[PDB]
Design a protein around this ligand. Structure first.
Ligand code: FE
Ligand code: FE
Length: 689
């Protein structure tokens, strides 16, 4: 029955053939034992693996999706690798090209002529025609997809397709005789390269090929500039903008295994030894990645140059992505179910009252906002990342994990500023706060850059202007992460009580809680960012520009901030120079940015619209705010949105993540985030290879 080995899942006799000997040579060299389980379809193998009848099998992204789905739940453990040694790639973007000139956008495709690579394909048929599902005018399944496509474009050239029922879909192909529209290279507009020649020649207005096609068809760079790419936001972009202007990303075939009790490590150790002893470029005849004579891609791909262990964070949907899973869902869904998902917002929520506030908002909204919930902020972001949720209102550090995973700022949380505004904000800009490093003018050995040695005043350990940014750019150049081996003695409330990081700290009236992250440790907050500096303890202090000119002039608490002018404090200064806190408008660190609402670039416009309206009934000036539910008002905990925000206000040419956060901000946050690692960020970076 079952031993210590790994049971592979063969689907053909020829597939079990290769495995019958894979198992034999594997005992012979001594490397993990492997036995075969032969079924009849990969679908079969899904079920056998899923109930302990087999342990491993490699599948397509269509079947990865389905194997990680409700009943079965297997996961991607290893990617295949394609290309040459110089350039191995794990995946690629399915892309839509068009002549530079034509001012048609993805939305206005209806009624143009298309060139496709081949019916039922990926890149050429399934990816583009499942994404366009909305505009198609298609009932769903038993209806041949192909007559909704027959009606949508005027003429086209979809290779494999029957020019018999539907002749315009074969209409623009270029084969003669009994090869016109053939489903081989005897139809000269077949493939990536023929879908492109279809377009170059003038037969279609768009081609659906992949990232590479133009680069491979037109070397020159001169020629390639007579083309644009249509992005999913409805714009056009040059042909190397495919990374940010693409239709879908297509993963390399994966080996899957069970999530519970999957035997991963075993399967992976078996895979390293046969890759090591029989893989591409090996001495042998038994080659893992290589098949017989009429036998193709048995087991693995004959095209492949190795395997790769995929991060344990990654599951069925992150491996695939949202764009791919969407392309699959719209091909086999009911125009019914399709415009319900197309219209409403699922809100990733975090923890339970954030849970109950959205379901409160849900019923309240008469269901145009719905609720997915993750056990954390990261698992929320991965949910939106795989289409299981559309939104979440995120801080500036997560925004970057967010924008590093393909995601985008929708609406910003415009602060009203705790007390009083007057009366409109949606269109009033965002400001954001000028992060600043202040000094005493009784000090003169001290410039940004003359600082290792000095005393610091931090606001707290791990807050945005008082730690993360001052420590970001300060530590940027070097790649050491010892953020205590730069100042002599810093007071950073959050740090170790004995260290060079809590030595200046105040403590409770010079008494109790010393170097503690609250008001009980006096030299903490803005507050004691300006008070270890202002009482000659700190040489410098990390605050927002306001801690000075909302504390100087004669204003803090009894005794220190009293009789202190503000022209007594001369700002600092990154340039290398130094000026007074007044104009912190040239002499700042970043502007530490507003908490925003991040979604995918598809949801974006719908979402934007639905939150201007949400806010309009329940937002600060809710014509139902006091009256029903209240947008900004948490159950005392900054739930869903932050308590002191005036409104959600549109970004304004502040549309990218790094166009939003600021590039001083990205640096800060990039330095640090290598120092403190994120597995959603590991998982993210891996998925570009
Ligand atoms: Fe393809
Ligand atoms: Fe802060």
């Amino acid at each position: 029955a079952s031993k210590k080995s790994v049971r592979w899942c063969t689907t053909s006799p020829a597939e079990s053939k290769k495995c019958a000997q894979w198992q034999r040579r594997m005992k012979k060299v001594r490397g993990p034992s492997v036995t075969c389980v032969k079924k009849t379809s990969r679908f079969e193998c899904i079920q056998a693996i899923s109930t302990e009848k087999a342990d491993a099998v490699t599948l397509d992204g269509g079947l990865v999706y389905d194997a990680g789905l409700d009943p079965y739940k297997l996961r991607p453990i290893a990617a295949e690798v394609y290309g040459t040694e110089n350039q191995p790639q794990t995946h690629y973007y399915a892309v839509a090209i068009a002549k530079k000139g034509t001012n048609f956008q993805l939305n206005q495709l209806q009624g143009l002529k298309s060139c496709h690579t081949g019916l039922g394909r990926s890149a050429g048929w399934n990816i583009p025609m499942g994404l366009l599902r909305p505009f198609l005018d298609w009932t769903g399944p038993p209806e041949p997809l192909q007559k909704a496509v027959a009606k949508f474009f005027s003429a086209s050239c979809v290779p494999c397709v029957d020019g018999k029922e539907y002749p315009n879909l074969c209409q623009l192909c270029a084969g003669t005789g009994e090869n016109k529209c053939a489903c081989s290279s005897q139809e000269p507009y077949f493939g990536y390269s023929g879908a492109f020649k279809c377009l170059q020649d003038g037969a279609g207005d768009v081609a659906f090929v992949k990232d590479s096609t133009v680069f491979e068809s037109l070397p020159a760079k001169a020629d390639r500039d007579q083309y644009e790419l249509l992005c999913p936001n409805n714009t056009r972009k040059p042909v190397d903008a495919f990374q940010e202007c693409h239709l879908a990303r297509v993963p390399s075939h994966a080996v899957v295994a069970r999530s519970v009790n999957g035997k991963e490590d075993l399967i992976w150790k078996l895979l390293v030894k046969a890759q090591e002893k029989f893989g591409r470029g090996k001495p042998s005849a038994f080659q893992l990645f290589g098949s017989p004579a009429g036998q193709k891609d048995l087991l693995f791909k004959d095209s492949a140059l190795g395997l790769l262990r995929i991060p344990k964070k990654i599951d069925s949907g992150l491996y695939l992505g949202s764009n791919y899973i969407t392309a699959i869902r719209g091909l086999r869904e009911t125009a019914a179910e399709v415009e319900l998902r197309r219209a409403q917002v699922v809100w990733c929520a975090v923890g339970s009252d954030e849970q109950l506030k959205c379901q409160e908002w849900s019923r309240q909204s008469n269901q145009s906002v719905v609720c997915a919930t993750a056990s954390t902020t990261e698992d929320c972001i991965a949910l939106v990342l795989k289409g299981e949720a559309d939104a979440l209102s995120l801080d500036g550090g997560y925004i970057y994990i967010a924008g590093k995973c393909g995601l985008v700022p929708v609406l910003a949380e415009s602060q009203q500023s705790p007390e009083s505004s007057g009366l409109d904000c949606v269109h009033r800009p965002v400001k954001g706060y000028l992060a600043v490093a202040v000094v005493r003018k009784a000090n003169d050995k001290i410039t940004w850059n003359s600082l290792r040695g000095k005393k610091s005043c931090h606001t707290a350990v791990d807050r945005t202007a008082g730690w993360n940014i001052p420590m970001g750019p300060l530590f940027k150049d070097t790649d050491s992460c010892r953020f205590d081996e730069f100042f002599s003695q810093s007071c950073a409330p959050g740090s170790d009580p004995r260290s060079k990081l809590c030595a200046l700290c105040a403590g409770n009236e010079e008494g109790q809680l010393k170097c503690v992250p609250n008001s009980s440790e006096r030299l903490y907050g803005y507050t004691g960012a300006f008070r270890c500096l202002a009482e000659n303890v700190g040489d410098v202090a990390f605050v927002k520009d306001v801690t000075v000119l909302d504390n100087t002039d004669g204003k803090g608490t009894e005794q220190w901030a009293k009789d202190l002018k503000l022209g007594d404090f001369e700002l600092l200064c990154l340039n290398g120079t130094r000026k007074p806190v007044t104009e912190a408008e040239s002499c700042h660190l970043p502007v530490a940015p507003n908490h925003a609402v991040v979604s995918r670039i598809d949801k974006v416009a719908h979402l934007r619209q639905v939150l201007l309206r949400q806010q309009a009934h329940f937002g600060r000036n809710g014509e139902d705010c006091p009256g029903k539910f209240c947008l900004f008002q948490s159950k005392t905990k900054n739930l869903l949105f932050n308590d002191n925000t005036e409104c959600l206000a549109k970004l304004q040419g502040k549309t990218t993540y790094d166009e939003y956060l600021g590039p001083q901000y990205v640096t800060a946050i990039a330095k640090l985030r290598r120092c403190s690692t994120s597995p959603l960020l590991e998982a993210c970076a891996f998925l570009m290879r």
